[PDB]
Design a protein around this ligand. Structure first.
Ligand SMILES: *[C@@H]1O[C@H](CO)[C@@H](O)[C@H](O)[C@H]1NC(C)=O
Ligand SMILES: Nc1ccccc1Nc1ccccn1
Ligand SMILES: Nc1ccccc1Nc1ccccn1
Length: 347
């Protein structure tokens, strides 16, 4: 189990002003550190966030968090469950800022809620440096869904933080799972019906921050562009491995697709082709032709394969590449055009 630590700086808070925190399992024989960002959509105005506080309060508050959590998937210490990094130091950072990990705004006389996701990541890193992270060789910032987009928004800031604090030997890398979306035409709840508005409004509500090189490309008012992987990824300097199902369930929900006649068949095939196209120049990626959402902390994440290579193997090959490799690929994108045309897709 990973044990809870509430942040010592109690001014870095979840939405309702309670302290943020992290769950930690130390591995003193390892110089590898995995920091995983939880997902779970977001909220973008007073009324929307009030609803989330009634029925999704663990995503807005630490008041009811458990003492411990079990590591699963890439967070498991069992080699049978985690062929990739079973001996690493494991950190789970709960998502309690409702801001896709972008916010830097405190509660105040003018703000009902605090949106501090970007500052929560900075403070966790900061406090871990006193608990052994100072001796790390690799810091892998990973995350799923909104946490996967959060990796893209924060990996270069963590790298800059560690350089400025005097730790230039720690190699910062990112792993973004199910956080790579298309701002495409829909097939036919504002957060699902009108996604780009929801992001634009959220950024202003959260005082949200995007990576500087991307911000400079799109300029004032157009920061929402940097929440889309194919637009922010080319501006990043840290190595980033991208995991994305080609027919992602959250993408299809936003597109108003529910599972088929010709119009919908053509729409679904075109979505796979467009996602494939955006990954063509991403050298470290894993994109199976399946209808699903998230993978890296699922216990059976070992089962899916692309061209005969599993995701744990592809990540191991990526480690080797950062020291093409014969028999050990890092770029794995399905070419077949319909969900579950890959036999290893999950049921
Ligand atoms: C605690 O965090 C807040 C928000 O980032 C910051 O203003 C303050 O300086 C921090 N306190 C300490 C002692 O680092
Ligand atoms: N934005 C929000 C806040 C409170 C309750 C529901 C929603 N809507 C929603 C739609 C799809 C997936 C998750 N949430
Ligand atoms: N979930 C989704 C799917 C397809 C298009 C837009 C969204 N919205 C979104 C919100 C924050 C960050 C990235 N995307």
């Amino acid at each position: 189990d990973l044990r809870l630590h509430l942040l010592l700086n109690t001014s870095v808070t979840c939405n309702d002003g309670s302290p943020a925190g992290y769950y930690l399992k130390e591995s003193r024989g390892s110089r590898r550190w995995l920091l995983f960002l939880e997902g779970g959509w977001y909220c973008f105005n007073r009324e929307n966030c009030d609803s989330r506080y009634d029925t999704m309060r663990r995503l807005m508050s630490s008041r009811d968090w458990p003492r411990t959590r079990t590591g699963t998937g890439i967070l498991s210490s069992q080699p049978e469950e985690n062929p990739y990094w079973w001996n690493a130091n494991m950190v789970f950072i709960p998502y309690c800022s409702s801001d896709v990990w972008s916010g830097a705004s405190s509660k105040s006389e003018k703000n009902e809620y605090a949106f501090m996701g970007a500052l929560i990541i900075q403070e966790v890193v900061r406090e871990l440096l006193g608990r052994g992270l100072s001796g790390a060789k690799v810091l892998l910032l990973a995350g799923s869904s909104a946490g996967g987009t959060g990796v893209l928004l924060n990996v270069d800031r963590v790298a800059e933080q560690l350089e400025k604090l005097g730790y230039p030997a720690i190699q910062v890398r990112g792993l973004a799972d199910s956080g790579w979306f298309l701002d495409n035409k829909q097939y036919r709840d504002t957060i699902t019906c009108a996604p780009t508005e929801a992001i634009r409004r959220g950024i202003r509500y959260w005082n949200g921050v995007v990576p500087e090189r991307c911000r400079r490309q799109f300029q004032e008012g157009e920061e929402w562009n940097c929440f889309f992987g194919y637009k922010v990824y080319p501006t990043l300097r840290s190595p980033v491995f991208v995991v994305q199902w080609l027919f992602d369930e959250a993408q299809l929900t936003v597109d108003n697709v529910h599972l088929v006649q010709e119009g919908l068949r053509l729409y679904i095939q075109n979505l796979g082709r467009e996602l494939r196209h955006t990954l063509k120049d991403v050298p470290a990626s894993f994109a199976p032709a399946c209808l699903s959402h998230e993978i890296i902390i699922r216990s059976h994440w070992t089962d899916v394969q692309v061209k005969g290579t599993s995701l744990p193997r592809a990540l191991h090959c990526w480690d080797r590449s950062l020291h093409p490799l014969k028999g050990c690929p890092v770029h794995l994108v399905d070419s077949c055009p319909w969900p579950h045309c890959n036999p290893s897709c999950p049921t």
